[PDB]
Design a protein around this ligand. Sequence first.
Ligand SMILES: O=C(O)CCc1nc2ccccc2[nH]c1=O
Ligand SMILES: [Mg+2]
Ligand SMILES: [Mg+2]
Ligand SMILES: [Mg+2]
Ligand SMILES: [Mg+2]
Ligand SMILES: [Mg+2]
Ligand SMILES: [Mg+2]
Ligand SMILES: [Mg+2]
Ligand SMILES: [Mg+2]
Length: 712
Amino acid sequence: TDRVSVGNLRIARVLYDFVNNEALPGTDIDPDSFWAGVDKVVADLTPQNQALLNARDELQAQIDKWHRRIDMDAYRQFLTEIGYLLPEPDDFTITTSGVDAEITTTAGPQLVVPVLNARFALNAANARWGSLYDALYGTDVIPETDGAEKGPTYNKVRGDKVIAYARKFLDDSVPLSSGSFGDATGFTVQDGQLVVALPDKSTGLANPGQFAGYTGAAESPTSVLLINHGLHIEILIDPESQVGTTDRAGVKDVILESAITTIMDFEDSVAAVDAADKVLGYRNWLGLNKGDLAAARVLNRDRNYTAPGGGQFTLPGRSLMFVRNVGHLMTNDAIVDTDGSEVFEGIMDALFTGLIAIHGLKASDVNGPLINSRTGSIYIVKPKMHGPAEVAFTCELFSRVEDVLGLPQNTMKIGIMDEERRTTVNLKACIKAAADRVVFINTGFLDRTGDEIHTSMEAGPMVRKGTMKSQPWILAYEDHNVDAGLAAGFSGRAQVGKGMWTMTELMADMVETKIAQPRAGASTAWVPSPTAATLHALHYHQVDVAAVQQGLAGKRRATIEQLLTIPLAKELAWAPDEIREEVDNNCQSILGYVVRWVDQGVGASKVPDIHDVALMEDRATLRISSQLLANWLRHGVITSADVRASLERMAPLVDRQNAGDVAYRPMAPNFDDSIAFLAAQELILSGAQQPNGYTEPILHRRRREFKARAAE
Ligand SMILES: O=C(O)CCc1nc2ccccc2[nH]c1=O
Ligand SMILES: [Mg+2]
Ligand SMILES: [Mg+2]
Ligand SMILES: [Mg+2]
Ligand SMILES: [Mg+2]
Ligand SMILES: [Mg+2]
Ligand SMILES: [Mg+2]
Ligand SMILES: [Mg+2]
Ligand SMILES: [Mg+2]
C-alpha cells in the first residue's frame, strides 16, 4: 500500500508528495491545514454529490418508462411533474465581479487543450498572438491550385496570394482614408498618428483611433499596432526578411491577437485514470500558473510597444487561462477512503486546481513570474452539469474550497457548459444559481447530442449523426443559450460561447462557415489549434459581436416545444447502404479514438475519420457514436451482427490509418485479444446502461486494465 493517511482519507503517495513539494510552497497555505480541509470537504460534500447523481438516475428511469408506457403537451406536463422541467425564474442580472477584460470585454477565439500534453499546452498559451502569413500559407485557405501549391521550399506565387489576402483583410478591418493597403509604400508615425505612404499621395486611417501603437522609431517603425473590435493586429516591418524583400512596403508578416483565452483541460481531451496521470496534469497546470512550464519550449513574455502619443505600454503575450475540471460523475483512486471507496474526482479537481491556480495570481522566484488574472479570479469550466441544483452544488463546492485555501469568497469563477438537456431547458435557473460566479456559458454538438440520444433512448430510432447538426432541437438550443445569457446581462460581463470546429485541416471551410457563430452573437467559440485560432480571429474583425448582442437582447427566439423536439427518425427513412454507412461511420469513430485512448493514454489528437478527413474531437465523440449505435440496436435498425461486422471491418482500417506511429499496437486480426477493441465493443453493447450515456466508467476501466497488463 502506497498511500498517506489523513483523517478518513488514504492519499496516493505520488499525489501527496506533488502537493507538498510543488503545489503548496509559495502559497502561504499551511500544509496540515490544507490536508485537513481536503478531508473535511470530501466528507461534507460527498453525500450531496451522490444524491445529485441518484436523482439523475431516478429522473431517467421515469423517462424510460414513460416512453415505454408524440404528444408535446402531455410530455412537458410529465417533465414538469417529475421535477425535470422547472419554472423559469424572474429576470435578473448577473453580479459576477473582478473579471478580467479578456472575458468581460473582448470577443475572440477560445482554444481548448489537453493539460496532460505540455507542448500543446505551451503552444496554446502562446497562441494569444499568431502569424496570419503562416496560417494562410500553411493551410488550404489559400487553395493549392496550379502553381500555388506548397512544396519543400518557399513558393513565391503562393506567398504573393498570402500577402494579397492579408492586404484585403487590413482594408476591410482598418480602412485607410483613401486608397488600399495593397498600394502601401511605407509607414511612419507623425503627430501621434499613423501615416501610410501611397504612390501618388499619403494617407491616415479613416478612423485614427484604430492606431494603437508601434515599435522602433516613429520615423521608421519596425511594426505598427492597430486595433479593431477590441482585437490587436500588428504589421511587422522588415524589408530584409524572406518575404519582406518581395513586399511593396517591406511587410514581413501580419500578426493577429488570436487565442484570447485558453481552456486547460482535465476532462474530455485527456486520459487520466489514476494518481500518476492526475499528477502529470496538475504539474503542467502548476507550470503554467508559475510560468516556468518548459517542454522538449517556454511561455512567451509580454509584448512592448510605444503608444501613439508616446510612452510605453505592455500587452499580455499569453492567453488568459481557464481550467476545465471534471464534472460530478466520476471517482478516481488517487484518493480512497477507509473502505477503499474512490473519492469524487470533481471534488478533488476543485481543491487541487484551485490550490495550484493561486500561483497564477502571483509572481516571484517561488511562484514563477507571469500573472494569469489581473483582477484576482480563478476561472473554472464545470462540464456535464444537469440542472440548477447541480450548479448550486458546484457553488457550494467552490465556496468551501475557497475557505480551505484562505481565498476571498467568489474568487473561483464558473464557466457553465450547457451540454446536458436538463441544463438546456432550465438554463436561466442554472445561470441564476451561479449569478455571482458565472463568467461563461457555451454550447456544443457532441456531448449535448449524446445526452439528447440517451435521454430519449426509449422513444424510437434517432436520425443519423450528421443529421443531428441541423435538427430543430439543436438550433433552438443554440439560440436559447444566447437568449438566456444576453437576458442575464452577459454582454460586457461574461462570455457566450459556441462549439468546436473539429476539421483541423479544412481551414478554408472553417473560415467560410464558422463566421456564423459570432454572427449569432457568441462572444467566443472553440478552435482546435493555434493556427485555427488565428484564422477564426478574422471573423471577429468581420463581425461586431457587441453590436450583434445589443440587437438580440430582449428577444425570445426558442420555445420549450422546440427544445423538446426529440430527433426521432421518420418511419423508415434510410436505404440499406445509408444504414451501413452510418454504422461504419460510428464504429470507426469509436475505434479510431478508443485505440489511442486505451493503448497510449491520448485523449485528443488528429484522428482520420472514415473518409480520411482529420478530426480533433474529444471523448464526447464517443458518447454520441456509442449512444447512436446503442439506440439503433435498441430499436432494430441494425443487428448485433451488423455491429460486430462493422467493428471488424473498420478495425484494420484504423490500424492502417495509424501507420507512422511507432508505439501503435494493431487490433486486427486478433480482435478479442485487444483491450481497445473490447472497450469499443463494450461502449456500444453496454451503451444503453451507462449513466446518461457517459463513457468514462468503461473507458477508465479498460485503460486501467491495459496499464495492469502492460505491467505484468
Ligand atoms: O462537440 C462537442 O461537444 C465537443 C467539443 C470538443 N472539445 C474539444 C476539447 C479539446 C480538444 C478537442 C476537442 N474537440 C471537440 O470536438
Ligand atoms: Mg519600442
Ligand atoms: Mg506566477
Ligand atoms: Mg463536453
Ligand atoms: Mg448555430
Ligand atoms: Mg431568459
Ligand atoms: Mg466594425
Ligand atoms: Mg462582447
Ligand atoms: Mg439505465
